[PDB]
Every structure is written in C-alpha cells, then in structure tokens.
Amino acid sequence: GAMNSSNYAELFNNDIKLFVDDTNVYRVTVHKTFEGNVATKAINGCIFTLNPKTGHLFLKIIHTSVWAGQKRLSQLAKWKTAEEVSALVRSLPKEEQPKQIIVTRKAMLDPLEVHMLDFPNIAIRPTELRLPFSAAMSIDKLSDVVMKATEPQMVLFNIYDDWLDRISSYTAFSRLTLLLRALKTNEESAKMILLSDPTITIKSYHLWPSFTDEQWITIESQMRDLILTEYGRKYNV
Amino acid sequence: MNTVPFTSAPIEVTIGIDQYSFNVKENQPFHGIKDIPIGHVHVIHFQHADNSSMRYGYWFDCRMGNFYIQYDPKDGLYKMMEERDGAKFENIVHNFKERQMMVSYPKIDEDDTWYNLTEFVQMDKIRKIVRKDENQFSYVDSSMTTVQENELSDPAHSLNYTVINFKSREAIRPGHEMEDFLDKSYYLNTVMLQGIFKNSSNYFGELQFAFLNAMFFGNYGSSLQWHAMIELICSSATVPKHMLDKLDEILYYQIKTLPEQYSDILLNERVWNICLYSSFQKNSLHNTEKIMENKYPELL
Ligand SMILES: N[C@H](CC(=O)O)Cc1ccccc1F
Ligand SMILES: N[C@H](CC(=O)O)Cc1ccccc1F
C-alpha cells in the first residue's frame, strides 16, 4: 500500500524500486498580456525518477513543444509522466525493471496504473513521506540541462555522486533529502552553505561538492540549522 | 392470467411477488398467487419469519411452464418446481381457486411500475447470468457472489454478470490510455455494446436485473453491477441519444420504487454524485436527477 515512516528501510532493500516525482513536469511563468489579461508561458520541465538504493536518476526532460496545442495541461502532465515512466520501464531489461514504483503525489496513481496495466506484477504505490524532490531544479547541473534542452531528452545522473563508496544508501538518501529540503526552504542560503568554501569543488562528473566525511557532518549540521532557522522565521519562534 | 400455486405454507414467511409483499402465518391455509400478468418476467421471493437471514427467490416467466412452490423441510426453504402434467396442474389450481385459497396479484390498472422495471429483462438472459440449466426458472439469494467478486467461491452458485472494470486492458486501448480512462465511450460502445451485449436492450436488461436483485435480495454484488453499468454510460462522452433518454426513464422508476429506508445501503453516494453532477451526462438525466434531488437530497 502506501509508504510511510513505519516501512522506511524497505527503500534500501534489494527489491528494485523507483520514486517518481512529477512536480516539475509542467512548469509555467504567469504574466500579463498587452490587453491586461493573464497568460502562461510554459518552460522546460522534467520527470524525476530515482532509484533510492543506487542513486540512479533517469531525468526525462519535458520540452515545451509537448504542450503545443494541448488543453488541460496540468491533467495532461500526469498522463505524459505516466507514459514516459512506462516507456522507461519497457526500455529496461527485465532484470532491471522495478518491482515497485512509488509516486510522490497521489494524483499520479491512476495515470501510472493505467499505463502499466501490461505490468501487473509492478506495484504502484503512494507515500505518506513529504519528499522534497520538487527542489531537484535547485541543483545547478540538473536545472542547466533541462533549460538548455531543445528537444525531448533523457539525461542520466547519479544523485549520490560517489557517496555510496563511503556510506550506506539509507544514509545517502537521508543526506539527499536533507539537502533538497534545505534548497526547498531557502535556496539562496543552502547554495551559500554548499559553495561558501572555494577549496571544495564539484567534480565535473558530480552534482555536489567533494566534501570529506568530516566536512559532510559540518554541512549537514548547517543545513539542519538552516531548516530550523527558516522554520522560526516562518512561524516566529 | 397465470398462477403460482403452493402445496402448503408450513413455516411463517413474508412472500414477495414482484414489488408486492404479504405475510403468511405458520400452517396458514395459503395455496399461492393467482392473476399474475402474462407478458413479463416475475420474481417470487421469501424471507422466513424466524430467520430473516437469506432472502431468496425465483425468477420465472409463466409462459415457459407451469411452476409451483413446495416447502422442503430437509433443505428448509420454499422451492420452485415445474409440473410436467398440464391436466393435473390446471385441476389443482382450479380447486385452489374455487376454495379461494390464493392471493391475487394486486396490480392497479393505472400502474406500469413492473413493466417499467423489467422492460428489457428477458428470462433467456437471466438464465445465462444464473446458471442452472435443468430448470426454466432461476434462483437468487442475498449471499450469491458474482464472477467478478470471486476473481477478487463456488462457481456453480454465482451471478455471471458481465465484468466491468475501468482499469483493465479490456477498457483501455494501448496508446489511448488517458483518452479511454477519462472518456469511457470506447469501452461502452465498442467493447460492451457492439462486442459483448450486441445492443443496448441486452445492456439495459442486465442493468435492470442487477438492480432488482439488489433491491429484493440485498445482493451486494448486484448493487455493484448496477452502479458499474450506470457509471459506464455516464462516464462516456459519446452515447446514443436514445440510450440516454431510455436510461433516464429506467433509473427514474428504479429510484421511485426503492424503499426509502433502504436508500443508505442500495445507493452509492460517489457514483450518483459523479453521474448527476460531474460526468459527461450530468445534464442528460433530467427525470432521474429530479427524483433523486427530491427524494434523497441527503445522498447529494
Ligand atoms: N553509470 C550510469 C551513469 C551513466 O553512465 O550515465 C549509472 C546510471 C544509470 C542509469 C541512470 C542514472 C545513472 F547514474
Ligand atoms: N405437487 C403436485 C404434484 C407433485 O407433488 O409432484 C404439483 C402441483 C402442486 C400444486 C399445484 C399444482 C401442481 F401441479
């Protein structure tokens, strides 16, 4: 059924699973028209499909041309997401196909179930976790490849860099969710924390800086403080 | 006008005949029901006074044979039987009629209720949903499950309604996932009407039969089936105009007939609110929407 804090270690067992977040698929800027009405302009988006055990992120870039001439785009976007996840699953060798797909928003359940009828053994599940995957577009290299795309495109990224050489996937997922929650709550500050020190760089083949174990503990502490700080600023505590 | 005679009434029982019902006391001199209108299916149903558990009954059509009810004390129920000997059956009915031991089917002349509930219901189609080929009549009770219910357990005692499932490969064309899920017209018109039912009359017949089993037996799987067949129509953007008009009439008489005190269990709030207020056909069921709003405004 639904995924929550009781069955949290299930994410890191040896059953292949993917998270699917559709929150950045249909993206718009709202603006005024010459006549003083309001209109939207779509910008490029992405599906965020992540294996939490391996860090594998299949980032399907959604080019604005897919919306051309279509109506009810917020509804279409869920079905386009489902279509692309289904296409990705079918593209994978059988032994790499997921056993479970967890959607971060319950409105994805029916579209994905319908697109996956051919895969009755793949469980489609919601989650009671509030996962900060919407903040994926705050990762500079992911935002860059989405915005530069001139056509539909699937970009492959390990969202854990090389962390799994030193930490478990539970710890790597916890680090990722803390970083993304911080970027979601105060992007400017979080980025400042991540790059304040110019001697720690991001390798060309990575997303995040090359922190040592000790430095990661410092960074993680600073991100918690940021989240707590914003929580206070928000609620006046 | 035909007759369903009884050998006797050894146990106290409420007897239903179509939408009518009456009480028979233990060992009361009751020999059956006369003046049954020819031309329609009928249902004679039973609820024992000492065990309201298990409503049960028999669908039959007097044009297909001479039927009667005898209590079986071993199996503990009123059973419908066929008498092959025409001569003897007519003489026994004649004697029951001379001794005035029968209740008269109490049809008001103005009253088209039963016709309107059974307009498309045929015995031949009943006998394919209820499989017991050695009999010309069909037994149904409160507890019988449907073929779909069993897939989600005795197959011989099942209600073989047409399986409707909106998230099934049958309902959804590869490559038209969103289209076919949000607009069920393909599933209604090509798969069900053209493919399985052949015409809307057979579809409405199953719909009406499902409602009647839900109402008269409290049969839960029948209620599920009735609501599924309504929803499939209401959720199709493309439905023949004559079907929508006929559906409105069918549902009107079903809602009109439903016992007020059984509305809570026989009517699915989600389906009805969706069908009347959100679906493609939300504005096509004028009569049904008006009786629902005046009779069950709570449900909505
Ligand atoms: N070595 C692969 C990275 C690559 O070659 O692009 C591992 C990988 C596979 C699939 C999705 C993301 C991902 F990082
Ligand atoms: N019980 C009669 C013969 C039998 O017992 O098998 C059949 C019958 C009962 C009552 C009314 C008409 C009729 F033909």
Q: Where are the beta strands (DSSP E) in chain B?
A: 2-5, 13-17, 20-24, 32-36, 42-48, 56-60, 66-72, 77-83, 103-104, 138-141
Q: How many distinct structural domains can be found in chain B?
A: 2
- DSSP-based three-state secondary structure for A39: strand
Dist CA A88 CA A91 (whole Å): 5
Lookup result for tokens 């995040």? A208
**CA A92, A96, A99, A101: dihedral to nearest 10 degrees?**
-50
Lookup result for tokens 């007097």? B62
Dist CA B271 CA B248 (whole Å): 15
- Which amino acid is present at B81? M
Containing domain of residue B5, as a range? 1-143
Same domain assignment for residues B8 and B128: yes
Ligand closest to Cα of B91 equals 2
Phi/psi at A107 (5° precision): -70, -15
Under an 8 Å CB criterion, which residues of A touch B? 76, 79, 82-83, 110-111, 113-115, 117-118
CATH number of the domain to which A115 belongs: 3.30.420.230
Q: Is residue A1 part of a domain?
A: no
Same domain assignment for residues B138 and B148: no
**Which of B108, B143, B178 is where one domain is finished?**
B143
Q: What are the structure tokens assigned to B155, written together?
A: 């197959």
Measured in angstroms, the resolution is: 1.6
Same domain assignment for residues A147 and A173: no
Strands A17-21 and A100-103: parallel
Dist CA B270 CA A136 (whole Å): 37
Ligand closest to Cα of A50 equals 1
CA-nearest of B218, B235, B238 to B273 is B235
The last residues before gaps in chain B (C-N over 2.5 Å) are 152
DSSP string, B217-271: H--HHHHHHHHHHHHHHHT-S---HHHHHHHHHHHHHHHHHS-GGGHHHHS-HHH
Q: For ligand 1, what atom is nearest to the CA of residue A158?
A: 14
**CA A110, A152, A96, A1: dihedral to nearest 10 degrees?**
-20
Q: Is the dihedral of CA B92, B95, B99, B103 positive or negative?
A: positive
- DSSP-based three-state secondary structure for B54: coil
Task: Indicate left, alpha or beta for B65 from its phi (over 0: left) and psi (-120 to 50: alpha).
Answer: left
Is residue B124 a contact partner of residue B138, using CB atoms and an 8 Å limit?
A: no
**Which of A163, A197, A229 is where one domain is finished?**
A163
Is residue B49 a contact partner of residue B12, using CB atoms and an 8 Å limit?
A: yes
Lookup result for tokens 């854990």? A160
Same domain assignment for residues A119 and A28: yes
* Mutation to test the A interface, candidates B178, B179, B183, B186, most A Cβ within 10 Å: B178
**CA A79, B175, B270, B297: dihedral to nearest 10 degrees?**
100
Q: B56 CA distance to ligand 1 centroid (A)?
A: 63
Phi/psi at A70 (5° precision): -100, 155
Half-sphere exposure of B145 (CA within 13 A, CB side): 10
DSSP classification of residue A16: -
- Which amino acid is present at A194? L
Same domain assignment for residues B10 and B57: yes
> What is each CA distance from B36 to B132, B139, B265, in whole angstroms?
24, 19, 30
Q: What are the structure tokens assigned to B199, written together?
A: 């015409």
CA-nearest of B235, B270, B272 to B251 is B272
Is residue B56 a contact partner of residue B77, using CB atoms and an 8 Å limit?
A: yes
Same domain assignment for residues B163 and B263: yes
DSSP classification of residue B145: P
Same domain assignment for residues A87 and A126: yes
Cα separation of the two ends of chain A = 37
Same domain assignment for residues A231 and A177: yes
- Which amino acid is present at B102? M
**Which of A119, A137, A163 is where one domain is finished?**
A163
Same domain assignment for residues A95 and A43: yes
Question: Is any atom of ligand 2 closer than 6 Å to the C-beta of B19?
Answer: no
Instruction: Using CB atoms within 10 Å of the CB of residue A77, give its burial: 0 to 12 exposed, 13 to 18 middle, 19+ buried.
Output: buried
**Which of B97, B118, B143 is where one domain is finished?**
B143
- Which residues are near ligand 1 (CB < 6 Å)? A 56-58, 156-158
Containing domain of residue A66, as a range? 9-163
Strands B66-72 and B77-83: antiparallel
CA-nearest of A168, A192, A140, A162 to A52 is A168
- DSSP-based three-state secondary structure for A47: strand
Q: How many distinct structural domains can be found in chain A?
A: 2
Cα separation of the two ends of chain B = 42
Same domain assignment for residues A23 and A87: yes
Phi/psi at B41 (5° precision): -65, 165
Same domain assignment for residues A108 and A216: no
Q: What are the structure tokens assigned to A137, written together?
A: 């577009």
DSSP classification of residue B164: -
> What is each CA distance from A57 to A16, A20, A61, A158, A175, in whole angstroms?
13, 10, 12, 6, 16
Same domain assignment for residues B150 and B28: no
Question: Is any atom of ligand 2 closer than 6 Å to the C-beta of B8?
Answer: no
- DSSP-based three-state secondary structure for B300: coil
- DSSP-based three-state secondary structure for A69: coil
**CA A185, A186, A191, A193: dihedral to nearest 10 degrees?**
-90
Lookup result for tokens 């040896």? A14
